[PDB]
Structures are given as C-alpha cells and as structure tokens.
Amino acid sequence: VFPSSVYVPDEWEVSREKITLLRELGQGSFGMVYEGNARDIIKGEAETRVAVKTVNESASLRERIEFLNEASVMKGFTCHHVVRLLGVVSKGQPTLVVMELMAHGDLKSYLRSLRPEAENNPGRPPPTLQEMIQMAAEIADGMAYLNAKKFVHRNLAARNCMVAHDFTVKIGDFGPVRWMAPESLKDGVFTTSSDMWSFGVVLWEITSLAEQPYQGLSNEQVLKFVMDGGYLDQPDNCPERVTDLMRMCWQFNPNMRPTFLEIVNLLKDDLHPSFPEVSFFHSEENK
C-alpha cells in the first residue's frame, strides 16, 4: 500500500515567492502552521493575509503525499462556513498549503479569552445570546455542507472551529472521549448523527466559555457515564434556547437527533442579514 499523488498543479498552484511567512500559529495535524501574507492570490486584492500549512520534517514520503492529496480534495469546497483553500505550492520543498486566515484563532482559545479572569481579555463582554445563536448557525451550516459533500467530521470541538477577523466562526481541519456520541464510544460508529452529538458539546463549550467537559471525571468514567445515557449539566445561567439545542443533540438514539440543516432551519430567523447571502443553507446548492 502506497498513495499515488492526485494533486494536479493547476490554477491552484501558487509560486513560492508570492508567500511571505510572519509567525507561527501552532502545530497542525501535518506540521507547523504559520500566519503569512500572499501577493496576488485573490483577484481584487494586492495582498491577502493567509494561514500556511507545512509538513513535519520527520514526515515520511507517504505522509507528505497524503498532505498534498488533502489539499487537492479541498479544491472542491466553496463554503463560507468552512475554512477555505486559497493556493498550493507543490514545486520543491517544503510543500505549502495556503488557507484563508482566521485572525482570531481557534474557538476554544477565543472563548477562554472572554472569561472575566482571563489574563488576555480583549476588554469585550462574553458572547451575547445573539452572537451564540449566530455561531451555532454558522457551525451548523459548515457541518451541513460537509455532510452534503459526504464527509463525516469525527472530531468536531471548539478547538477545531476557527474565528475570523469579523468573528464569523468556521469549520477548520478534519479528516476525544468527551466529545463522542455513546454509539461511537460503544461501537466505534461515526456518522453525521454522531457529529451532531459533538456539535451539542461545542454549544456547551460556547455557553461555558470553554470549560473542560465532564471536569472531575476521568476519561474512563466519562466513557461509562456517556454510554449509560448521561450527559453534560447545563452551564450556569445558560440561555434556554441553547439548552434546548444541546438537549436535541444529546438524544441517546442517533436517529432522534436533528440534522445540521434542521439546526440552521431552527435558527434561520434570528441571524445577521448577511447570512442568506453566504450560507450553504440558502444557496442553490442546498437541494
């Protein structure tokens, strides 16, 4: 077994010289991710802020190929609520995969920065109900898109959601006992329905400002607790509407949980005016 390189140097190929790296953003599944700038990568803008993925130096040839193969797959995604591919540098080493930059980082980090005791509090109040409903809809929309494209996330969590410069939340990377559905923990079965369970946990993270799920329980205890039918307690003074969403996501029977499109449908009337203009839900592709 050995993967063939499916990436085709096409319109997505970007000359290395157009990419300038500024700083490290953190380790990605394949290697260090950097914040950078790209010259003339998007029609209409002289330079674009970007995130640049690289592959570990210790990576095998096979892994380097898998890295590029994932980039090729991303050429087919065009959702506003899923972090998008902008370009690829496959000529020579190191291989670079250029993505749109999410200036505010992962959702977990962002949430924890809004905590009152946060040493890096931006001086802004925690998410309002309105902002939470908006985040829920954006995340659900991105997930609905992946589901339409026939992809199961398997790792949805606040740490894997990203926040843009205008605070739009998007699905980040994807191919964690505290985020897994009981059926997944029991039979290793992953579906869009188990993704829904994880979505509920993300809502819980949003309403608790990223507290650790089931804090106090070992991974061992969580495994039994969840498979026994137990679920997370509602965070203090959690908005009733978000609590209702969580409860739907945590139905023991996966068949009883809502779909991501149904989540967006439930929230559609309470979103920013721009939502219908950018969502998968309101696009002609949602059929």
UniProtKB/Swiss-Prot annotation:
Changing K53A: Abolishes the kinase activity and abolishes interaction with IRS1, SHC1, GRB7 and PIK3R1. Changing W204S: In IRAN type A. ATP binds at S29, K53, E100, L101, M102, A103, H104, G105, D106, R159, N160, D173. The modification S-nitrosocysteine is found at C79. The active site is at N155 (proton donor/acceptor). There is a cross-link at K75 (Glycyl lysine isopeptide (Lys-Gly) (interchain with G-Cter in ubiquitin)). Changing K91E: In a subject with non-insulin dependent diabetes mellitus. The modification Phosphotyrosine is found at Y7. Changing I139T: In RMS; reduces insulin binding. Residues 1-287 are cytoplasmic. Residues 19-275 form the Protein kinase domain. Changing P182L: In IRAN type A; moderate. Changing C79A: Reduced S-nitrosylation by BLVRB, leading to increased receptor tyrosine kinase activity. This is Insulin receptor subunit beta. It comes from Homo sapiens (Human). The gene is INSR.
